[PDB]
Symmetry: C2
Subunit: 593 residues, 2 copies
């Protein structure tokens, strides 16, 4: 496996070994082939095999009780058995070192890309004050940030970083005793790398390829604008387990941002990159016949999934990799160039100085998600660099050319596809869409354990309102949305998020009228909407065409759906009766069928 640096990872391990000295042992039967194994201690639990169901949403979506994708959505094995299954399958892998020429194209590209990214902005340290305002305004952690003992523990670790040491920065793929430490490890990386998000280095204005701060309602408009650029097909290749395909070489090139930092900042970022990103101590659960053990494992490469900076760094490396693939397709890169150690910077720099930015404007990149419209279709077959870099495509043989899209409306990006709709008044809307079962299925999952009737009904309302705003074009979703909003007390404010997505702007987290909010988003504040004439009725808010709706998972046409649509008032009354005597509205009167 990894030959570990005990002078970087040792202290972190020694602290774990000492916290659990009673049960600490070295299990010779450890499964780890590609990760370094340090030892185990005794647990349990830590997870659940079945995710909680929202009674409100399930009661108002009966035809979906027999839809397999809907029911699949709630099946997640968080048990040690489950954790070990995914680990052995997806995480315990080694990526072969890219060829010396590949490593050289990557470094030239990364140098140029960071220079380009920092042309107007400058890296900076993020502060305690900045972190505090974020925890407060993003819903146990809120108290920790107000306890001066948390900030004393944070300074303790920062002082170790200044000495090139690491005491508590351990990650885990799974009281104040260990939850104050978790937040402390997150602040220290926020302090050094948080500027990437806070200062919007990945915004479309700054990065050309980025979409940071755009929002789901805007991504489709962006894809449509890219579709306007002369060139080949639109390629949206998915990488199999991207985070695991992040090499020691990608980490070395990502680090180059430090070259733009002031001496005080550069020291803390160097500590994060060196001690936590390029050397990691992980704690993964393992079921034993007896009970549950916690294993202590370490790696040099791969990305840490929960980390601050995972989005921007994945976005940066992907932009770099897609630039390298465009060079290959254009003929600038060859098999000889990737195999050559003494690769010449000249033709690559020439292509970056002259073509670079233009080529970036042909892409929509968000973490591991990319949409690329090359100058021609040779890119489909430009796989030498991609595969050698470790960015192997998911569900496709290694040397099979990529599938390109000729219709932008069909391109997969950020778990959606985007439809162009014509409103009754002739104005066009570009709407986010995804398989309906994925939306209903997710809506049916109550977040956390034993949540009160209030939180349950409010989270249902959050989902219903997200649908009125983003997925109003889906027949089943507008009906279910009206049903939920009629069944939940009007004055009840939506609580808990419907998604952790970067692209979610949570416009539905309100008690404001949904048509008023719809107008703000789609008409008033929409940059691609010239005519600001308001929509006064949901009658003038469009739907997908019947057959597009059916292709995207709609149940319209089904006897079971027609039955549900008709008998929805009874289901609403049932939910009202279960909630109690509260102030409710009827939202069904909007062309009731």
């Amino acid at each position: 496996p990894e030959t570990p640096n005990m002078d970087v990872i040792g202290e972190r391990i020694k602290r774990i070994k000492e916290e659990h000295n009673s049960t600490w042992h070295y299990d010779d039967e450890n499964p780890y082939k590609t990760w370094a194994y340090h030892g185990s201690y005794e647990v349990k639990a830590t997870g659940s095999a079945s995710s909680m169901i929202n009674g409100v949403v399930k009661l108002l979506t009966k035809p979906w009780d027999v839809v397999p994708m809907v029911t699949q959505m709630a099946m997640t094995d968080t048990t040690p058995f489950g954790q070990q299954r995914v680990f052995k399958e997806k995480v315990d892998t080694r990526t072969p070192r890219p060829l010396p020429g590949t490593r050289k194209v990557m470094e030239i590209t990364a140098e140029w890309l960071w220079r380009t990214l920092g042309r107007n902005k400058r890296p900076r340290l993020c502060t305690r004050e900045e972190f505090t305002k974020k925890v407060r305004t993003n819903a146990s952690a809120k108290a920790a940030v107000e306890d001066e003992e948390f900030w004393k523990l944070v300074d303790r670790e920062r002082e170790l970083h200044k000495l090139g040491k690491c005491g508590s920065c351990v990650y885990n793929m799974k009281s104040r005793a260990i939850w104050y430490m978790w937040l402390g490890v997150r602040y220290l990386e926020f302090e050094a790398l948080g500027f990437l998000n806070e200062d919007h280095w990945f915004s479309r204005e700054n990065s050309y390829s980025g979409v940071e701060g755009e929002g789901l309602h805007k991504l489709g408009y962006i894809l449509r604008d890219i579709s306007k650029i002369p060139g080949g097909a639109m390629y949206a290749d998915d990488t199999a387990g991207w985070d695991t395909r992040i090499t020691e070489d990608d980490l070395h090139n990502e680090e180059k941002i430090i070259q733009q930092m002031d001496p005080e900042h550069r020291q803390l970022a160097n500590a994060i990159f060196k001690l936590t990103y390029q050397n990691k101590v992980v704690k993964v659960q393992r079921p034993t016949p007896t009970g549950t053990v916690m294993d202590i494992i370490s790696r040099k490469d791969q990305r840490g999934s929960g980390q601050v900076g995972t989005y921007g760094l994945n976005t940066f490396t992907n932009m770099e990799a897609q630039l390298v693939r465009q060079m290959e397709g254009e003929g600038v890169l060859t098999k000889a160039d990737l195999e050559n150690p003494h690769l010449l910077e000249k033709k690559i720099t020439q292509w970056l100085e002259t073509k670079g930015v233009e080529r970036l404007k042909r892409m929509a990149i968000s973490g591991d998600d990319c949409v690329v419209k090359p100058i021609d279709d040779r890119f489909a077959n430009a796989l030498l660099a991609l595969n050698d870099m470790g960015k192997v495509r998911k569900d496709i043989p290694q040397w099979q050319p990529s599938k390109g899209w000729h219709d932008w409306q069909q391109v997969p990006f950020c778990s959606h596809h985007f439809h162009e709709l014509i409103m009754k008044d002739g104005r066009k809307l570009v709407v986010p869409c995804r398989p309906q079962d994925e939306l209903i299925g997710r809506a049916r999952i109550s977040q956390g354990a034993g949540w009160s009737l209030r939180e349950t009904a409010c989270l249902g309302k959050a989902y219903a309102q997200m649908w009125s705003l983003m997925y109003f074009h889906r027949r089943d979703l507008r009906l279910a949305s009206n049903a939920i909003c009629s069944a939940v007390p009007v004055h009840w404010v939506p609580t808990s998020r419907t998604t952790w997505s970067i692209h979610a702007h949570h416009q539905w987290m309100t008690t404001e009228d949904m048509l008023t909010v719809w107008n703000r988003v789609w008409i008033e504040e929409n940059p691609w909407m010239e005519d600001k004439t308001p929509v006064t009725t949901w009658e003038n808010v469009p739907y997908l065409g019947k057959r597009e709706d059916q292709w995207c998972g709609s149940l319209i046409g089904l006897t079971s759906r027609a039955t549900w649509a008709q008998n929805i008032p009874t289901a609403i009354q049932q939910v009202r009766s279960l909630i109690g005597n509260e102030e409710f509205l009827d939202y069904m009167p909007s062309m009731k069928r």
Copy 2:
């Protein structure tokens, strides 16, 4: 609406009102329309909205990840929201009093039926010693941690608390017998205690097998799932009309004050001490019941204290036998109606003729009982002719309204016994390679795979999980070996779980389950014992030495009952099963395994 007999129910409520004085209140916004409302108190919420998944079984049944009836099984809402949903839907209903002529046919039938049932047996008290030996040995009474009950029977304080309540019963009073709703040692000791007092008076019904086919003619108590199909086939041999297996909508809720009074008639056969305790159970806990039910409020969770005169208590000892008795009675009454013995006229008149009914009972009764297979609310009836299909006057008036069928629509009869639904199964007649016939239990495959995939709440130990998977796997080898997908999945699970690991935790709470699969004995040896050696309907005792001579349903029938055979996804799973087995083994560890896939060598 409810008019509560406060002299009976009062003390029980007063006791609750005391123990929870801090939060006790009368909530004016209570939903109860048919139950009497006494008051509420705030409690810390109980139950789960999602059932735990078996990682072992799910890993070895991948094609079923996309089968809807499979994932359906995992959906159970036990939260206050869920409890209130079911309650408002079925439990909060009133059954109109049967007509005076119906009430009279019912009483004559019930008198005759109990005297027939007690012709050879005599009611008796069940002992503390018997109750302990049953809890210790996890036997069967009313059917996730029974280890709490294991301890309770050893403390003489539990038995002192029992005694206190028994003395109240002897005086016609009730202090602690309250029923808890579904779907702390102090309150646990009370629960078990209420269960024992019920067992002491009425447990003789199960323990002495009053509902065995020998004693009751219609009963199937102690027969077992492997025997029910043979029984249906034997009933199919009796000259008469079609086979009727009508399902009653929420039977327990349709048990009237009149059914409870007729059920009580068993007391007429009891010695004065026994009769005293049974009278206390019937009149104070069955004919007047105090219930604890949860209710979600915007603020939090409240526990509600409600009361009723009629309806059956679902978790009670004696629910099986009493439901079996009333159903036998009701199906006898429906047979009388179809035969012309009962009329719309007869069901109406208060001063009814016992003569015509007794004549039919003394002459026809027992014969008519031998035409039925009754198990609680489940009935299979083969009448003398098909007039029974339209004989709905008494059935509907008694409150035994049929599920998912318009009130006056004639019933659907089966001409093929193999298609008759009974005890969640149907039964296929299979011909073995050697020409011998087997009568096998069968049900939709999705229901079996779905249930297998449910890790029984508590028990998250990889050992407990894999061992419960093995219990399911072995139940399939014995009862559902005839299902292609199930024999393959069974061999896969048994190959994936260490050989010496004993199956633990039950696969079912069914009365008909005999748990022959709860062993490390060879499954083919156990299969032989059950299907050949000890099968009364198997004349030729020639042993089966290979699973290759153990039959399957015909490809067609297997597909009708939910088999995935023919599907590319199934062919893929069948082929790649060794990888899935290795995965579970890797996850389990370095243990002693055995490959059972070559039982098919390997198909």
